[PDB]
Amino acid sequence: MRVTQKLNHGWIFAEGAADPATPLAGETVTLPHNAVDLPLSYFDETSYQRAFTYQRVIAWDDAWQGRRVQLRFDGAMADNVVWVNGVQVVAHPDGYTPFVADLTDHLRPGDNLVTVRIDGSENPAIPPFGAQIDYLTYAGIYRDVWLMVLPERHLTNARILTPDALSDAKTVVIRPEVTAPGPVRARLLDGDREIAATEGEGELTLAGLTGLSLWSTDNPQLYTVELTLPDSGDVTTHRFGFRTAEWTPQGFLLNGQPMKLRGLNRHQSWAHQGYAAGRHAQERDAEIVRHDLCCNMVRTSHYPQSTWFLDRCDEIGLLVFEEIPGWQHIGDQAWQDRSVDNVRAMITRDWNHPSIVIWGVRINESPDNHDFYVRTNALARELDPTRAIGGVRCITDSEMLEDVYTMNDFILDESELPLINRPRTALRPTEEVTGIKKPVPYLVTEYNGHMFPTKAQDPELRQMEHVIRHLEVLNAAHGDPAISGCIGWCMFDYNTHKDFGAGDRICHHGVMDIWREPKFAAHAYGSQKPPSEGIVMEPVTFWARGERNIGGVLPLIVLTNCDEVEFECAGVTRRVGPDRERFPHLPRPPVIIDHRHISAEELGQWGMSWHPGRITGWLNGEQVALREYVADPLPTTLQIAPDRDTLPADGDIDLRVMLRALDQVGNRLPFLDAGIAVTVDGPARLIGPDLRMLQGGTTGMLLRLTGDAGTIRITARHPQFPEAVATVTVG
Template structure:
């Protein structure tokens, strides 16, 4: 069966298979930034596929044959990679669909090497073709993926084509409705990585749980000749230890040392070198202990109060995705100026530039996967995707000591299916990494009068409880803020993971009238919440929602929102609202 136009025949059966067949990328190697690589960022040629009519054959480039004719052809239109298409072309501001990207990759093989294409992230579904051959695909907009291309890539110029589709899906994560902008595109770095035939694929080098002087970890090799030893060196500590590789290519690491522990006040990172017979990897790694004791979060043996802020991976002034070190620095500098020692990377794993820079700046982190509100917990297909995203998040960032909390979900409605699934995911998370805390943000509570009780059964499977509660905004105060009582059925610490209200920067009005969206109401709302917080004996941290106004088609109040969520302490132009100073003063006293 075919669909015929005047000048082009499109095989529908190929198109159907292309759009519907699942294919999967390989698990990406650890620390791609520390490897021999060719950066493929920059201008990529693009074609917007408005009606999803294209196939790989449709877009197989014909530019080398000047006499060839195709309706679908890469020509003058380009987009920046990394970057989203919504902010680069006005006609794509709200676009949800497919865009085809093309890059000519000049490759020179260096000795007996393997070659890999590594993508830091592409939202949401990516299908990758090299020299006319499909090499794989990946689903999920916020985690890395790679393909080995040793047998496909050739010396000289290679034709790399990537189809990216950001259409919201019932079976996607997040699903059809989510409260942030659906930026599409190749939004993170792209690398061509070369390794030795047998190479260091992965490693985990962190302090043993509840220890402050012992590393229990591992190094894993891939390739044909994995026998032998690996060496882990920490030059500053004069540590140089050799460990035997087993038949599975894995060496178990056990190192004791007098470490200077990482903390927000002293974010100490050590140069760590890993050697095998054929490969070398270098990383900057910090060591710290994070625990829960009763209702306290304990860092390096001492209770710590998390002075936090949430932010999206967005530069509001540019109205686009944050993509590089400069963008990360802007967001994290705001957090430090506010007085934070903690950031919530909402609501998805953010760029590795942001994670590494936050760690170097002394910011503890909460990182989560986008299991957001209306997820069908009785659908095994969706659950497999969620578990895969969780694994990809942990695998990428497990050596970043600044991350202290893995979060499983945000604002999911309690149910037997949800509790069962998230309990399983908590176990998976701890199996992947037992050294950090596990949490999930709730927005369902038992409220009677002025008493709010945390009784969600999922709490049994979590280390830290987290509450999203917009007192005074979506619902009125049941009594004076100082008379609101929080209780918990669980002897665990609580983070107030979201609170606040909306205000338009420069808009003014009475402190008791939220209908005018004035800064004064938002300011008073923050004062009232702080009064309430001071009455919660098991409170271990607060994290206002949100650092800066952010774009979302959910928010369409034409007078005040205009496509922006206005809960930011900063405006979309970076202007400080009155509530900014309330939180800054609160943090200065904690």
């Protein structure tokens, strides 16, 4: 019988490279941990590019007698090396992938020193390093660490295969990985109900399984396989689901039904704390892509991400594209060996996730490299023949060793350039890009991003064009039968190197800001929701007379899953439907109100007084949404909106809390350049500065819980607002 327990609490952290065998002097920390907390903007991204040292005292326990004692590290950036009483026991250069330190043969009857040395240097021998990167990797032991006490003969892994999953009688085939020969018993479980069982050395089959359900994006049905070694007592469980995912030239199909893919790329970074955000924060990103942004797919730009994120995609029905750590650069032979190791470590950890339906085996936006990618493609196919292979490029006529030509197409809008005769084009035709006459599976894996940076507080007009651009691409993808779908660049604004973004160490490419608060472009994606799952209706306006050139709010884009939208202003009521002429292939084309529906004269257009407005959403002639705008917004409410009011007593939790400066009818004050002064008491600490800058009228913060019970109290203050307080009960 094994015992696993999270061992994040009680580490000691210090700058530099300390003697592994002596007690370390430094601060007590709770993992996940980021070595150097950064400002939001305009910082020296090399500040973390240096060595750090962590240490854990682990008392010997007599209940471990004759058992293996291991530490699993779920991830650390980077160049990791681990010592146990001064003796080195593993070293693992990669920053995105797990590694195990077997302590067993080096433990002594009292306290034991486990020392971990890391370095965040951009070491050219460790992918993705070697040159430029349009993201930051930070540093720290930014993922969980687990103390595992195992019987000698124990499970290290298992693979669950679902041959012929679309059948009324299903089959589960399981291939355990064990440390020595002997029986393995399996139980198929539906939560707590035992479906079937089998015992055997070798491959274990359960067949003739009736009444089970398919995993899909709508019904995320999961089952568990419990594995037991009857001789050693060991037990492990692996969730999977039953599902099929085929990339055919006619399109992507899920469980045999066609599905047009609609996704965003998502980094694993946050402001200030880098990658060191725990289970709860990881799970929240998944939920936001899936629900708020109503995507059926996410891409792990540009590395293996957290098991918590992937588990959460399993539990809520979000398809995943996961790739090896990369950003354009291909190092030497040895570098490529490590990239090939990365492929193995990515797929062996993640092969049971029904959410994962495609592997990225090229370095993102690399040039071609025949002998390198022959290797990555071969290895992926051997380790997992059940999923398609992709690998992201931004060039035409690329050598297609993989199953899907996964392409970043940035043609929108090149026609701005000076000697470009070609008209504004949202997406290229597949034959042009691939160079292959024969139809091949094809997925656009990024678009927009750097082609159209749009900051949270940028002008209404610019944000309109940003909205339009996500809409155009999504529409061209839904309209081209040869395009399996499209994945926008990108979910949120992210910190980058001095070589990218706006000089501020930020790429303003998100449809959401860096706190994952929507900008207007977000509801382009969210508005594709079916109405049964929620009404979305967001006008693309701040409702100010002279924000825009000339004045007025026409043309007004309304992002919505309503069948028609009503406009009331200045005694004019006008009902308008979704703009199908313009976005004919969108599931939920937006409503655009303009000169065709209302004239200048009607609204006293540029006849001096600014009026309030009301915008109502209609579904089958029934009013389902209402958005008011006042002519005269004034600071009315400083809203503190934590993602939860209640939390357990758990020091892994990073609680997101948004601050929004709101007028008399609850709209944000977009151009209020201001610091919200924040204090936090209770069992949690504020991450980042004490003063929070509004951008586009909102900003956000994460509060890392300490793990004690108590009440968190959040005070936010600004001289134009009433003092605002919020509490979250913990434990």
